[PDB]
Amino acid sequence: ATCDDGRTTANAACCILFPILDDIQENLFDGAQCGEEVHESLRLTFHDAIGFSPTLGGGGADGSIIAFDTIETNFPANAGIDEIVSAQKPFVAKHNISAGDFIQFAGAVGVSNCPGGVRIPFFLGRPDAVAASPDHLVPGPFDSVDSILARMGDAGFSPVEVVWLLASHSIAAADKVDPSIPGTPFDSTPEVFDSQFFIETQLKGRLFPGTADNKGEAQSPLQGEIRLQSDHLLARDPQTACEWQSMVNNQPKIQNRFAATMSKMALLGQDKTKLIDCSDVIPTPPALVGAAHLPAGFSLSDVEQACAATPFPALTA
């Protein structure tokens, strides 16, 4: 089909996404950049979607975290999420798409601004949210690996899929874990969707980027990078260590698994055959140009190898 401004898309009902695309690129993402607003919106897809539990309820990726922000932003694990919810809410009021659709579309559009990124499959037609997510369904940085895995497993994700999803931390920073150093990134290239995150969380901790007493935080390997205790443990846990390391210097796998796994997550509580495929509306991301690497002056001896079957790959530094 061909839309009114001449732009084309496979299914005619996708046409209404183009003015939304233009709006968000200029006014949410501040000129199509891969900065803070993109990182925030990506976090929002997870905080929306993961409110889904067979035994307690929640409609998953349904927009409840906007529609019922009053409740859901009261959950400790949604600390800091109010900012991006209030940034997004006007877009949803102004345009004609459900909140569920908007959160997933903006996350996918955002990720497409990042070098190395992918086009997350996007589907249109999520009905408005009809209930608030139950409490206590969003994992935190102080939870154990077993607890994180059991929660994600409860929402339909296996341990390897939890790992793939965590490629999102390749474009990420924390504001609340250590409020004295807000905006400190999880890897050295928070504007680049690459494997530096899986490499750098594997280094021995050296120091604390700000204060030392912070719940959910591990020693970082670098002044200038912050490390979650959960990422620290996942990178070293016998259940997840090998999959973690298999992401290193493996951008084709990170791309493939992240797009597919985000797609599954974007559809929690939803049925894609009742929805319209509008994937081709997401922009084409820039490619990487620079090789994966250890930070300069670090070597293999700085790496806490945790995969018994496969030694950590020999990267340049």
Ligand code: HEM
């Ligand atoms: C699996 C368990 C996970 C834990 C325990 C976890 C924990 C965290 C924490 C503590 C922050 C920092 C919040 C702050 O203090 O500002 C964060 C940021 C982030 N999370 Fe995760 N997360 C998890 C999984 C995910 C998943 C599946 C996604 C997929 C989209 C995701 C995407 C992000 C993004 C994009 C940010 C950066 C936000 C920004 O820079 O504004 N997280 N996460």
Ligand SMILES: COc1ccccc1O
């Ligand atoms: C994902 O963001 C969080 C914020 C505060 C506490 C736990 C979290 O998982």
Ligand SMILES: [Ca+2]
């Ligand atoms: Ca939800």
Ligand SMILES: [Ca+2]
């Ligand atoms: Ca990165």
